[PDB]
Design a protein around this ligand. Structure first.
Ligand code: SF4
Ligand code: SF4
Ligand code: SF4
Lengths: 620, 620
């Protein structure tokens, strides 16, 4: 926890959770079913109740069909973000979408290198078209046996073989989601094993979306490089127009950032002495935190609380992980919750649609409204907590290897590799996932982080996990000296002073939004290649102690298919099926290297994670 | 009904249904969300308790989001069928796939006239090459404002403009299923009106898949023409090896049927003096019956009873509506449940994969596995009820027009309209639907047809609904002379005796499988184009007295969006929201012209349907 801005008149996410107590144990068990209108069909595993549904389907085919349908939804969620980015890149290539451009042409040529596109003497718009045509191809191929272009280009070669031999390499992101929906229909795919393999194949179609999203978003806006930022509710200035950007797509926020600069004088004119101060919520808040250093107000669960300070002039949303309660809560104040997307309206908000073509003028309209919301701000109701915590963020996979080249420009990975074979770094944990109410907010992350840090493992974080470490200052050079542990701290401070920081590198390491989890794969696959090996051999581990979204389920599943022991700290609906639970814990260990780790205890989970790393080290 | 193989000590669909009593009711009203792993949050409508989910979404977001995902899983189910035909038509245009070919070169040409393929002096394979490309574009177009190819080309140009101006013409089948699962992810679309409107678009994609599948499948296997067949379990033979074909895809069955004939001389040699008995279950059987007249054993709920006869040697199952209990109901006997699709495997059943490049060869293998099970049939455990109801089927839209051309070959549609303005044909009804255990099998189907036919309205049917009418004897000439009203019986008898068949046209005309519901919208659009109107003005109505599947919910949802008053007889999860209910029942009569009629009383349904039929006659 952290802030505690007591409503005392208003329902919040914590209130609505307790009024749901107790929650249906059937659904939490995975023994609920509503796929056809002959249900609802439940399974009584014990006292001689119904052991089958009207379908004839058992507990295992019921639990599994819902597992992969959840993975499929999270894949559809991530892929819709990457599709907008690739559709842009196709418009940038055709002299259209003028408000956008290739702001990082260095990242663009490197993307075309990993994809095989010629760049020598070709001109920018030709490469961009070759890059958009390929990336759109992953959304339209019908040859079930042709892997996704980004997957084949971006994994280790050993992994590409392992999955293609099992048919786990997707051919089409849209078709993977749709073929998962169709096969889980009433009376279609039954076999729990065929089902779970079908969820792992569509989990890879999520990885594709996350890769092409991160890479082409860099080329659109710039690769993150280390920057100083600040987190928590304190970053709201009373003397400023406070604009919260919540959602996922930086195509809106990165434009709002630039327009917020030229529009400062209108903020001062309306009576805001400190201009307009835009703040970030959730993954779009991380995108502009990663890139431009814009502060991060809060992560997921505490996203209604900015309106509670009585000084949020407008919260601009687009898609995903935004709470439908926000038009209700903002009606008690002056706040303007502004929806933007064609496929993301909240009843009671204010919709201004984002014409990507007319981008910077739609921004002005948005900021003009929030300047006018400042006009109706009640001044004796402002109550901003003074919690602002600083954090060094912007640690893209590119920048991390750059700071290593301040230690060895010849072999930039050699310090990392050498410091692993000797034990200063026992391993790497990547903290992923959102916020759940069945885990005390931010506590499981911080418990796990310092426990594993102390054990000499490097911590990387993304999304609402990096947001939970951002606040509570584990993203500081000081957090490294206090909790790292000697061997881990010795290296962390070496690179930390090689690149001009001021101390060591922060304990945890921001890599960005959930799609930017593809950065750590790029980090790890290059490592796995330097050693001439695969990720199912590296002392590498993922952990989602507080996960909820279907994205978190899809993200975690391809973390298994890639080779990582993946810790889940919020129990998916599998416990009702011992057979499915065997499939993802055992069996996965053998087929695909990675495996799941379901533990609700942050202390005992970090014991299995270190054990997984220590077992992983032994294999070398 | 009528058969019911009351078998002792074996569990069936009805036995498994009654084990589930009572079923949740929260899920029946749609007041259980189940998306985000912080739930399952449920809504209490009356006595205090929880009024929201933890994300903050009200009952109307929870209800709308689940309905819209059922529409998407139903579109994915049908679209995957259509994509198989389209890929086959592409291997066909290139010289791959030597077992399949353009059997109805005629159909191929009329499919190309409309939809705009140029034919003038062009080889057949160039014409079917353009057809394969255009149709595959409906699965890969990324221009959001580019309507689907078939949709624009196939339904009335007035409805093209309406749905276009409402934004309901889909641009891509695969991306409509995906953008649906994404926008219904946690924290995404929440406005009830927006969600159900987006579900109306992913429903118009099920019309696309159904359209291309039906039309293209005809060119590959032949456009159905009137054929006499037989229905019910009495279609099995003890002196023949009985092979059942369940599922949906005709690409398998049509082969199996042809190969069975060439493999008759090996059957008799093994002891099957009557050869290969290929019986049909669900839609695969409907496809081959409509085209070749093969017998249909049963529909959905009674697909396990053919095993109880002790005379089923194999059940070759491909995709969709295949009960997972069948492998368990075998073993008890000698039957071989044989799965074929890589995305449709059932634990305990024998899987031999179906390569379409090696269709006939695979076919022979399957059939041989059954002629081996014939030599394992316990002859002391045979029990074929001997219910063989003769059925006249094969009534494609083309066949209907031809019969109306045997009376007026200059204005073939004039006999229809004239008899609708005078009153002899008060209207038409399309009976779609499956089979649910909450309504006695086939009961409401039969009752609703007779009550309406007496009121002088033509009865058309598809799928398991048509199977119910076939096994009941409403698909014969005598049924018209008995239950049809005077005016209707007159027109039917005239066209009949004028188009051979020596009698009146069947009371219920078999229009085909689920995808063949596009034949009814074809006939309707043609009549509406002869009268200068839209389907929203024709006295046309759809009814699903025993729906249960997601495909049916989608099949009914595009019927509403094309302008048809649709009746549902199983109550979708919608009662929990009066807003969503009103949106799909009342405000749809203002936006898209069609609407839903939830009743569940078969008597009150027909009264309301006839009221709508007569209301459409007020106009015109
Ligand atoms: S539908 Fe299933 S998860 Fe929802 S309350 Fe009922 S038993 Fe529980
Ligand atoms: S799909 Fe089968 S197990 Fe699921 S609700 Fe329907 S009848 Fe029950
Ligand atoms: S999206 Fe909201 S209502 Fe639905 S399960 Fe999650 S928290 Fe509950």
């Amino acid at each position: 926890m952290l802030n505690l801005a007591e409503a005392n008149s208003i329902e919040t996410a914590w209130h609505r959770y307790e009024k749901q107590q107790p929650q249906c144990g059937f659904g939490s068990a995975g023994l609920c079913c509503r796929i056809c209108l002959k249900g609802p069909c439940r399974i009584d595993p014990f006292g001689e109740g119904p052991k089958y549904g009207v379908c004839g389907a058992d507990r295992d085919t019921i639990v599994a069909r819902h597992l992969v349908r959840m993975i499929a939804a999270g894949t559809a969620a991530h892929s819709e973000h990457g599709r907008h980015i690739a559709l842009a890149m196709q418009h940038i290539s055709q002299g259209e979408l003028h408000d956008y451009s290739i702001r990082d042409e260095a990242k663009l040529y490197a993307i075309a290198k990993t994809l095989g596109v010629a760049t020598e003497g070709r001109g920018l718009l030709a490469i961009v078209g070759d890059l958009a045509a390929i990336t759109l191809g992953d959304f339209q191929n019908q040859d079930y046996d042709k892997p996704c272009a980004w997957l084949a280009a971006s994994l280790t070669p050993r992994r590409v073989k392992r999955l293609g031999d099992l048919g786990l390499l997707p051919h089409n992101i849209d078709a993977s989601v749709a073929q998962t929906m169709s096969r889980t229909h009433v009376g279609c795919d039954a076999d729990p094993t065929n089902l779970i393999l079908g969820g792992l194949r569509v989990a890879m179609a999520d990885l594709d979306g996350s890769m092409l999203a991160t890479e082409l978003s860099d080329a659109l806006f710039g690769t993150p490089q280390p920057v100083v930022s600040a987190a928590n509710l304190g970053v709201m200035k009373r003397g400023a127009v406070n604009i919260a950007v919540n959602g996922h797509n930086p195509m809106l926020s990165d434009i709002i950032c630039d327009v917020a600069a030229d529009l400062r004088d209108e903020a001062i004119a309306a009576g805001a002495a400190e201009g307009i101060n835009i703040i970030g919520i959730c993954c779009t808040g991380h995108e502009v935190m990663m890139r431009h250093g814009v502060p991060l107000a809060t992560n997921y669960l505490s996203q209604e609380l900015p309106i509670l300070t009585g000084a949020l002039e407008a919260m601009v949303v687009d898609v995903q992980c935004i709470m439908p309660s926000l038009p209700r809560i903002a009606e008690c104040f002056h706040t303007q919750i502004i929806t933007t997307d064609k496929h993301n309206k909240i009843s009671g908000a204010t919709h201004v649609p984002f014409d990507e073509h007319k981008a910077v003028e739609t921004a002005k309209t948005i900021i003009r409204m929030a300047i006018a919301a400042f006009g109706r701000r009640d001044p004796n109701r402002v109550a901003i907590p003074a919690f602002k915590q600083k954090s060094i963020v912007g640690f893209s996979a590119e920048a991390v290897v750059a700071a290593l080249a301040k230690v060895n420009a010849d072999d930039p990975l050699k310090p990392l590799v050498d410091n692993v074979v000797n034990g200063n770094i026992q391993g790497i944990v990547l903290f992923v996932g959102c916020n759940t109410t069945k885990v005390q907010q931010d506590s499981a992350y911080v418990d796990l982080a310092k426990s594993l840090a102390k054990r000499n493992v490097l911590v990387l974080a993304t999304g609402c996990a990096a947001g939970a470490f951002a606040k509570a200052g584990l993203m500081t050079s000081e957090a490294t000296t206090q909790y790292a542990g000697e061997g881990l701290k010795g290296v962390l401070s070496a690179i930390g002073t090689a690149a001009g920081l001021g101390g060591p590198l922060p304990l945890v390491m921001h890599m960005g939004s959930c799609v930017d989890n593809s950065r750590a794969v790029a980090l790890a696959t290059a490592l796995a290649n330097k050693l001439g090996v695969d990720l199912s051999d590296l002392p590498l581990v993922a952990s989602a102690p507080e996960c909820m979204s279907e994205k978190a389920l899809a993200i975690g599943s391809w973390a298994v298919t890639i080779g990582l022991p993946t810790h889940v700290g919020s129990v998916p609906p599998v416990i009702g099926s011992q057979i499915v639970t065997k499939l993802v814990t055992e069996t996965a260990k053998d087929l695909v290297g990675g495996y799941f780790i379901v533990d609700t205890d942050p202390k005992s989970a970090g014991d299995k994670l270190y054990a997984a790393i220590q077992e992983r080290r032994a294999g070398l």
